[PDB]
Design an enzyme around this catalytic site. Sequence first.
Site, mmCIF file in Angstrom:
data_model
loop_
_atom_site.group_PDB
_atom_site.id
_atom_site.type_symbol
_atom_site.label_atom_id
_atom_site.label_comp_id
_atom_site.label_asym_id
_atom_site.label_seq_id
_atom_site.Cartn_x
_atom_site.Cartn_y
_atom_site.Cartn_z
ATOM 1 C CB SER A 1 -51.783 -59.506 -51.284
ATOM 2 O OG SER A 1 -52.588 -58.475 -50.298
ATOM 3 N N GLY A 2 -48.480 -58.776 -51.596
ATOM 4 C CA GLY A 2 -47.262 -59.788 -51.427
ATOM 5 C C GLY A 2 -46.321 -59.081 -52.313
ATOM 6 C CG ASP B 1 -49.272 -59.138 -43.963
ATOM 7 O OD1 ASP B 1 -48.876 -60.291 -44.082
ATOM 8 O OD2 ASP B 1 -49.967 -58.566 -44.821
ATOM 9 C CG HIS C 1 -52.419 -61.415 -46.313
ATOM 10 N ND1 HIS C 1 -51.491 -60.043 -46.394
ATOM 11 C CD2 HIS C 1 -53.000 -61.128 -47.436
ATOM 12 C CE1 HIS C 1 -51.675 -59.583 -47.401
ATOM 13 N NE2 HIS C 1 -52.379 -60.203 -48.036
ATOM 14 N N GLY D 1 -55.292 -59.381 -55.525
ATOM 15 C CA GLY D 1 -54.157 -59.900 -56.366
ATOM 16 C C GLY D 1 -53.090 -59.447 -56.356
#
Lengths: 223, 57
Positions: free
Chosen positions: A177-178, A84, A40, A175
């Site tokens: 995420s990932g 994801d 995402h 902020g």
Amino acid sequence: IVGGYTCGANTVPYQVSLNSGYHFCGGSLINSQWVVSAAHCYKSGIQVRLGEDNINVVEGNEQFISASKSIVHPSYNSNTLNNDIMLIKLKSAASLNSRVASISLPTSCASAGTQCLISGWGNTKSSGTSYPDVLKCLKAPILSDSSCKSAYPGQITSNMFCAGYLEGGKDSCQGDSGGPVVCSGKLQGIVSWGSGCAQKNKPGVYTKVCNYVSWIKQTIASN
Amino acid sequence: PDFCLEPPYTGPCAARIIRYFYNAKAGLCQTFVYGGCRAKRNNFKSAEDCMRTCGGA
Ligand SMILES: [Ca+2]
């Protein structure tokens, strides 16, 4: 990161920032040319920023390298959030040093109760908005699949796990995420989703990296 | 129900992506934080797109 602490400059040397004119996601360096992040977090024109501490200042150890490929898992489902994960290739290889270093992929999955380190430049408030200058860290345990499913009925796939504290107060947030969930020196998770941030009974949900190790290695190698 | 009149929706994902929404109380397109998944329709990648779709709602 809500309820965490200041990491200290370059103490998490595999942590990267994904920038599209501003910081929008984290990622984890897995070799000198490749970063793991969330599907995402896909955008065209990503710049990867390595060696960062204060993301609003040029401090002296940064490397800014554009993405040459941003490869979303071919089975990412943007409704259920299954699979994801995304791999980003750097247009030139990063210079590895004490402040810019890769993190190992897991050899096996981690168990409930395993303590991990989660990091990022995301919001630090559970109510309201405050984005940090410097990298924040949180120690949190992996939770059981049973508890994760109870928190989020019908929503947890075999490629997700929960981590955190059911009483609230400590979580990843917008902020983050990932970015990495690292347990015993292995990248076991990617920050993915949750319900609010640091709310009671609503732990964070993370992509289960151990399920993707063969795919990651083969995808890297074929690109 | 006009989707332009719905409040902006961050959603459950944990990105910090700046998007636009039409703010009918103010009569203009404004920025907000989108988390990266499960967008509702009052969510645009530019002010121009937002104005084109929702301006004057
Ligand atoms: Ca900096």
